[PDB]
Symmetry: C2
Subunit: 100 residues, 2 copies
């Protein structure tokens, strides 16, 4: 179980990212990337793409929600992050989840 | 749907989306009827005229990478030589994926 998640859940999440060409990269961070996760741990993803806007963000969130995954998926936009502590962790401990 | 979780349905649809030769994906068998249970197999017939053995093998391998609990049987419509099977696919088949 990569990041503790089954392979089909990873491919489904990756599949929604493929639907949007604006996503250059998808970065996994938090407990799943650290290895300090549990079964109830959330899935923290950070998408990189300057063309990404609020209309896209809500569209990915809606499609991921329709997946009905047991774990919560918090999706973020890198160019939107205002927290320097959050950014430092993403750039230091981030894992390459998906490439365009 | 069909006693399947949503993320598994999309994951299977994901593989089908990756191949332009696939026109439709028809789900038959225990699923699409009431007989299926937990652990029943996934019977899928693909429609296309560009599809052949090399694609077929590749799609099955890509779904093997999914590591699904249920066994997935993939068939090509233009290769079904059992008329009773083909009649049932037209009779009770439910459209799983469309271009």
């Amino acid at each position: 179980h990569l990041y503790g998640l089954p392979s089909h859940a990873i491919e489904a999440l990756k599949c929604v990212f493929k639907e949007y060409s604006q996503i250059d990269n998808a970065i996994l961070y938090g407990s799943r990337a650290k290895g300090t996760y549990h079964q109830g741990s959330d899935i923290d993803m950070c998408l990189t793409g300057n063309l990404l806007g609020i209309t896209e963000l809500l569209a990915i969130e809606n499609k991921i929600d329709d997946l009905l995954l047991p774990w919560k998926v918090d999706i973020s936009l890198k160019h939107t992050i205002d927290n320097p502590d959050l950014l430092e962790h993403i750039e230091r401990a981030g894992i390459l989840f998906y490439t365009k």
